[PDB]
Amino acid sequence: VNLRTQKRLAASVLGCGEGKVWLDPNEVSEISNANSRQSIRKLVADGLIIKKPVTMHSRSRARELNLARRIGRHRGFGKRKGTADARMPQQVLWMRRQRVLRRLLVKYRASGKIDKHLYHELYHLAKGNTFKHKRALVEHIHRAKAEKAR
Amino acid sequence: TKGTSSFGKRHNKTHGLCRRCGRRSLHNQKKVCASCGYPAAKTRKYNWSEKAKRRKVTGTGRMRYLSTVPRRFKNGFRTGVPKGARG
Amino acid sequence: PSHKTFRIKQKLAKAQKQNRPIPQWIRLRTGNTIRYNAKRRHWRKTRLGL
RNA sequence: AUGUGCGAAAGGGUCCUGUAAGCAGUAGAGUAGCCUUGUUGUUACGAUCUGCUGAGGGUAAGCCCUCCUUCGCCUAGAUUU
RNA sequence: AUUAACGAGAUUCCCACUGUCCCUAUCUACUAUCUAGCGAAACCACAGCCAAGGGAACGGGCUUGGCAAAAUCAGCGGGGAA
RNA sequence: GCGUGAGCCCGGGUCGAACGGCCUCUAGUGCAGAUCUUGGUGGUAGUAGCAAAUACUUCAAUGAGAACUUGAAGGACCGAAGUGGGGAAAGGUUCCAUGUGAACAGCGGUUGGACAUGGGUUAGUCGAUCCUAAGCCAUAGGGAAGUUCCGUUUCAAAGGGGCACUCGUGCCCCGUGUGGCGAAAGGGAAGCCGGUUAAUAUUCCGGCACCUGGAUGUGGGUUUUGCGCGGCAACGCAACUGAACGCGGAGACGACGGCGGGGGCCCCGGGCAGAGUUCUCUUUUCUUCUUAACGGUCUAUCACCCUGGAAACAGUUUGUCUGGAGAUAGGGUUUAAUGGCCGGAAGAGCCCGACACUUCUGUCGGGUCCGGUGCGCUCUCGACGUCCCUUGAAAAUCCGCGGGAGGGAAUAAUUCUCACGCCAGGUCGUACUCAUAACCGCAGCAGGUCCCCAAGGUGAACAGCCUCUGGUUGAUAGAACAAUGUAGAUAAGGGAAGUCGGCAAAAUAGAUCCGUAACUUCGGGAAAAGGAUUGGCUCUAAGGGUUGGGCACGUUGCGGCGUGCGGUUAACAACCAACUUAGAACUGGUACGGACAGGGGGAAUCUGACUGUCUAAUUAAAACAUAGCAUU
RNA sequence: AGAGACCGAUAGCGCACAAGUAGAGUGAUCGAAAGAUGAAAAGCACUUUGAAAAGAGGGUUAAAUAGCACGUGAAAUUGUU
Ligand SMILES: [K+]
Ligand SMILES: [K+]
Ligand SMILES: [K+]
Ligand SMILES: [K+]
Ligand SMILES: [K+]
Ligand SMILES: [K+]
Ligand SMILES: [K+]
Ligand SMILES: [K+]
Ligand SMILES: [K+]
Ligand SMILES: [K+]
Ligand SMILES: [K+]
Ligand SMILES: [K+]
Ligand SMILES: [K+]
Ligand SMILES: [K+]
Ligand SMILES: [K+]
Ligand SMILES: [K+]
Ligand SMILES: [K+]
Ligand SMILES: [K+]
Ligand SMILES: [K+]
Ligand SMILES: [K+]
Ligand SMILES: [K+]
Ligand SMILES: [K+]
Ligand SMILES: [K+]
Ligand SMILES: [K+]
Ligand SMILES: [K+]
Ligand SMILES: [K+]
Ligand SMILES: [K+]
Ligand SMILES: [K+]
Ligand SMILES: [K+]
Ligand SMILES: [K+]
Ligand SMILES: [K+]
Ligand SMILES: [K+]
Ligand SMILES: [K+]
Ligand SMILES: [K+]
Ligand SMILES: [K+]
Ligand SMILES: [K+]
Ligand SMILES: [K+]
Ligand SMILES: [K+]
Ligand SMILES: [K+]
Ligand SMILES: [K+]
Ligand SMILES: [K+]
Ligand SMILES: [K+]
Ligand SMILES: [K+]
Ligand SMILES: [K+]
Ligand SMILES: [K+]
Ligand SMILES: [K+]
Ligand SMILES: [K+]
Ligand SMILES: [K+]
Ligand SMILES: [K+]
Ligand SMILES: [K+]
Ligand SMILES: [K+]
Ligand SMILES: [K+]
Ligand SMILES: [Mg+2]
Ligand SMILES: [Mg+2]
Ligand SMILES: [Mg+2]
Ligand SMILES: [Mg+2]
Ligand SMILES: [Mg+2]
Ligand SMILES: [Mg+2]
Ligand SMILES: [Mg+2]
Ligand SMILES: [Mg+2]
Ligand SMILES: [Mg+2]
Ligand SMILES: [Mg+2]
Ligand SMILES: [Mg+2]
Ligand SMILES: [Mg+2]
Ligand SMILES: [Mg+2]
Ligand SMILES: [Mg+2]
Ligand SMILES: [Mg+2]
Ligand SMILES: [Mg+2]
Ligand SMILES: [Mg+2]
Ligand SMILES: [Mg+2]
Ligand SMILES: [Mg+2]
Ligand SMILES: [Mg+2]
Ligand SMILES: [Mg+2]
Ligand SMILES: [Mg+2]
Ligand SMILES: [Mg+2]
Ligand SMILES: [Mg+2]
Ligand SMILES: [Mg+2]
Ligand SMILES: [Mg+2]
Ligand SMILES: [Mg+2]
Ligand SMILES: [Mg+2]
Ligand SMILES: [Mg+2]
Ligand SMILES: [Mg+2]
Ligand SMILES: [Mg+2]
Ligand SMILES: [Mg+2]
Ligand SMILES: [Mg+2]
Ligand SMILES: [Mg+2]
Ligand SMILES: [Mg+2]
Ligand SMILES: [Mg+2]
Ligand SMILES: [Mg+2]
Ligand SMILES: [Mg+2]
Ligand SMILES: [Mg+2]
Ligand SMILES: [Mg+2]
Ligand SMILES: [Mg+2]
Ligand SMILES: [Mg+2]
Ligand SMILES: [Mg+2]
Ligand SMILES: [Mg+2]
Ligand SMILES: [Mg+2]
Ligand SMILES: [Mg+2]
Ligand SMILES: [Mg+2]
Ligand SMILES: [Mg+2]
Ligand SMILES: [Mg+2]
Ligand SMILES: [Mg+2]
Ligand SMILES: [Mg+2]
Ligand SMILES: [Mg+2]
Ligand SMILES: [Mg+2]
Ligand SMILES: [Mg+2]
Ligand SMILES: [Mg+2]
Ligand SMILES: [Mg+2]
Ligand SMILES: [Mg+2]
Ligand SMILES: [Mg+2]
Ligand SMILES: [Mg+2]
Ligand SMILES: [Mg+2]
Ligand SMILES: [Mg+2]
Ligand SMILES: [Mg+2]
Ligand SMILES: [Zn+2]
């Protein structure tokens, strides 16, 4: 008995690959009489032709390592292969910081904590490498208004 | 790399089928047949090859009209029908 | 190729109608000398020139 | 070809590595919860450490012993002088 | 005539390194090797054990001696002026 | 048996249609050699060999016969710059089904791209057909004995548009110009989803659309003084006359860099179904949860408009541009959906469950949700920037405008680019392969041959290594382990003593932190040279986003606001989210870029400045080219 | 159309035959091999062994020492006796 035609027809009807088609080993004579696509469907309904499941591929170990690195477990000096700028480029660090600092100054000026003359002077100070982060800018503003009070 | 490697790059055609003689001898870019000389009015023929002349001389084809002239000459190029024929 | 012209299509049709063996009753005629077909062509053996 | 026989296992000896899985602990840098607020207060997480443990694994394929462990086999078939 | 940088460009020395060497040993895979199946080519006057002699001045064959016992397998690189 | 000899004669066997002696005549008349010509056949010899691309094993069935046929079950490889899914050139039936003695598949064969008999390619929307490019060829003319050479707008009387016809015959305008071929990757009118076959499908069936050309009628629009209204404006609205002649726009264009928006893929959390594991653990691991063309409606950078008038200058990008030639601010208009919602459309497709059913046949229930994240990958759009002694096609075709020729109603008229309605769309290609077997290399040859799509982990990464979907298990086999080999490797002590010559091999190598000479065209040399660290576990610190802010009047089913104010919380509270960097303790046979991946260095001489190029198949160089300089 | 002191299938034209054919080359062009069963197919009915190809009997013929691998059937080279 030659069943090459039946296996090819089954894959098209089941919508799978020919490596996922199962033919009943004890009904080869009955299966060999199926020559049309209609007869293949009837043998699928009766349970002589089934589609096999996929092979296992799990990401359990992958997302386990990800969580351990959120608390700093696998990021030592013996675990780095690229350069510092390849892992975290400096241009991205600079671009983030300028957007953070410029977002704050617009917020203060809109509410009223500062006026435009102080806004302009702080803006060009931030363009220079003056304020290290958000905290440094806020402390500088408080001292500036304290001396302006006198 | 001349030889086996270079032979793999041959996938174009210098000549196609001629409309007058039927051989694959029509040059694709020049549009001139290398065998019968189409589209000139005369047919290409040279006296330094007797073999080539005999391959296409009169009598190598069908002679659709010329083969019935000797019979008409022998009877005098007459017209009409034989005496009291019907029709 | 799938792209063809009508002249090439006409040629390919004739080449396969001329590729069948001789009938059997030809071999029983009086004074016959034909044994087989001496002009058989195969796509894997001889290349036809367009 | 009945034997101090031949074969397949097993037990012991000899060598090689280096202390198995499992369970437990007043061991463990610390952390997060819950209560009567403890002299070990408990519940959860924890590389590793300690005990059972010179243990576990392998060992003739061209290592040794077994009348003192178990199971099987055997006085042919063919050719020639 | 000089000359920084550059070079799968030629040359000499130094440090490190090693079976390149003293001096050679051992292991793995595929062959070769044996079997079943399948199955070529180059080449070939006739052939195929030597020593000396003379000879076209370096013989497988001639002359005088040495000798000399079926059919065969794996390798080898002296000769066949291969 | 005869003859010195070339030769002649007879006996026996096989066989089946013509042949000889003697004298003259006549010639394509006698073979061992020519590396002689054509054909046939030996030894070598059952010999050399049939060894790149990791690999097969068990049971059953078929059959005279099974390592290389089919089913199931194991073990493996390709590892998304694939041994996957589709195409262009080229081939031409190699595609599908049934069957089969020989020959072919360098072993076998029940199998085959082989052999025999039948079957298979469906378009107004995908192409060709239309346009022009580099180029090729006609016409006017000039050469040449001539086959023919040049010439493409020229030293040419070179065209096209309208109106009635009694009925074609007849009238009237404009005129500088006047051929064709040439792209299945350039330019260009129009189709999407689901199903269906042994073999075709954006082509067949069902549903739902679109384009061009041709005729045409209803509804609506305009006009009673003739060809529409609104907005300060940018402009809007279902329409809303427009000939000759002319102006403009689209077609229509380079390479590279960072940044922002959108679709698809990847990743994380929850829920409903189904499956795998369960000595112990795991609210656990894996799979499905979809939405087309064509339309409606609300929005989305640039830019433009109105008010007003800026120095204590302001606005503002990751990247310094913008503004009295009018900024900030307040309010508007508009190019641009692959964005949200609705029609299409759940009736489809997909996942579960329960009954029928020899077949013919099926039938019925459920479900088909909700969020997050990013220097992620891929395609597309936008605003910016850099480079040039380099500035990056043409034509067909379609639209707007300037002008005002002609024509038209007061009961009808309307050459209204608005809605709906009627008819038609010819011809050729379409199967299959696109390569360790369908193309070219004499062949089923480790060679060569233009593209599209592109998953998880480690990691800087399209590096190497392992896996999922999909695909293979095909390269003659069985047994044994001699020499000599080809390919892969390790050696005590010495360390180039070997050799023409360190040829081959070994040694170094990622990342972080220190340190770095002579010389120099000041740019380099430079990763110069030379050092130290790196695992696991338990902790600590730093780098962000969104939403809230107190009174006094009036309106509104805690109101949301029209306001008059007051104020800068000595910056507080709640919620949300990935990664990157720095420090400490503990721990181990001191090991930790633990595989993969991965520079040896220095002091000098000769010579060419550098980057580039050549003898396809023995020479890659000091040879050629080059910028600069000089001469004619 | 008629002839010959011509050739007799490696000769005579390249071709006595489905020959300017099959086949090679991008192309111009290059270009073969291959005649004969018997007077007549009367071209082997039946039985038996074999999966089949075929063998052994038995038939036709004047002859199968003529079976379509077909008149006669030499040498090189090979098997048995
Ligand atoms: K233990
Ligand atoms: K112990
Ligand atoms: K060089
Ligand atoms: K050998
Ligand atoms: K053999
Ligand atoms: K001698
Ligand atoms: K002699
Ligand atoms: K006789
Ligand atoms: K043999
Ligand atoms: K192999
Ligand atoms: K393989
Ligand atoms: K068409
Ligand atoms: K139609
Ligand atoms: K066509
Ligand atoms: K057409
Ligand atoms: K042109
Ligand atoms: K002329
Ligand atoms: K085109
Ligand atoms: K069909
Ligand atoms: K109306
Ligand atoms: K209107
Ligand atoms: K273009
Ligand atoms: K983008
Ligand atoms: K994107
Ligand atoms: K996206
Ligand atoms: K991802
Ligand atoms: K469309
Ligand atoms: K100003
Ligand atoms: K930047
Ligand atoms: K790309
Ligand atoms: K008018
Ligand atoms: K098709
Ligand atoms: K197709
Ligand atoms: K193709
Ligand atoms: K990856
Ligand atoms: K990788
Ligand atoms: K060996
Ligand atoms: K060996
Ligand atoms: K040396
Ligand atoms: K020397
Ligand atoms: K290191
Ligand atoms: K010198
Ligand atoms: K160079
Ligand atoms: K060379
Ligand atoms: K070179
Ligand atoms: K040169
Ligand atoms: K100079
Ligand atoms: K001949
Ligand atoms: K040919
Ligand atoms: K007789
Ligand atoms: K007989
Ligand atoms: K005979
Ligand atoms: Mg920088
Ligand atoms: Mg050409
Ligand atoms: Mg009549
Ligand atoms: Mg001698
Ligand atoms: Mg001598
Ligand atoms: Mg000799
Ligand atoms: Mg002698
Ligand atoms: Mg040798
Ligand atoms: Mg020798
Ligand atoms: Mg006769
Ligand atoms: Mg002669
Ligand atoms: Mg001879
Ligand atoms: Mg002689
Ligand atoms: Mg051999
Ligand atoms: Mg092989
Ligand atoms: Mg070999
Ligand atoms: Mg195999
Ligand atoms: Mg691999
Ligand atoms: Mg693999
Ligand atoms: Mg097939
Ligand atoms: Mg078949
Ligand atoms: Mg074979
Ligand atoms: Mg065979
Ligand atoms: Mg077969
Ligand atoms: Mg065939
Ligand atoms: Mg089209
Ligand atoms: Mg011309
Ligand atoms: Mg002329
Ligand atoms: Mg054209
Ligand atoms: Mg195109
Ligand atoms: Mg229409
Ligand atoms: Mg107008
Ligand atoms: Mg929708
Ligand atoms: Mg929309
Ligand atoms: Mg503004
Ligand atoms: Mg809807
Ligand atoms: Mg449904
Ligand atoms: Mg197909
Ligand atoms: Mg392909
Ligand atoms: Mg190949
Ligand atoms: Mg081929
Ligand atoms: Mg990573
Ligand atoms: Mg073998
Ligand atoms: Mg070696
Ligand atoms: Mg050593
Ligand atoms: Mg040592
Ligand atoms: Mg040393
Ligand atoms: Mg070397
Ligand atoms: Mg260094
Ligand atoms: Mg140096
Ligand atoms: Mg140079
Ligand atoms: Mg060379
Ligand atoms: Mg070379
Ligand atoms: Mg004659
Ligand atoms: Mg002959
Ligand atoms: Mg002849
Ligand atoms: Mg004969
Ligand atoms: Mg017989
Ligand atoms: Mg006879
Ligand atoms: Mg014979
Ligand atoms: Mg004979
Ligand atoms: Mg003989
Ligand atoms: Zn021609």
TrEMBL record, chain A:
Transmembrane segments: none annotated. It comes from the Eukaryota. Residues 2-145 form the Large ribosomal subunit protein eL19 domain. Belongs to the eukaryotic ribosomal protein eL19 family. This is Ribosomal protein L19. It comes from Chaetomium thermophilum (strain DSM 1495 / CBS 144.50 / IMI 039719) (Thermochaetoides thermophila).
TrEMBL record, chain B:
GO terms for molecular function: rRNA binding; structural constituent of ribosome; zinc ion binding. Residues 74-87 are annotated as: Disordered. Keywords: Metal-binding, Ribonucleoprotein, Ribosomal protein, RNA-binding, rRNA-binding, Zinc, Zinc-finger. It comes from the Eukaryota. Belongs to the eukaryotic ribosomal protein eL37 family. The keyword rRNA-binding applies. HAMAP family: Ribosomal_eL37. Component of the large ribosomal subunit. The ribosome is a large ribonucleoprotein complex responsible for the synthesis of proteins in the cell. GO terms for biological process: translation. Zn(2+) binds at residues 18, 21, 33, 36. This is Ribosomal protein L37. GO terms for cellular component: cytosolic large ribosomal subunit; preribosome. InterPro entries: Ribosomal_eL37, Ribosomal_eL37/eL43, Ribosomal_eL37_CS, Ribosomal_zn-bd. PANTHER family: 60S RIBOSOMAL PROTEIN L37, RIBOSOMAL PROTEIN L37. SUPFAM superfamilies: Zn-binding ribosomal proteins.
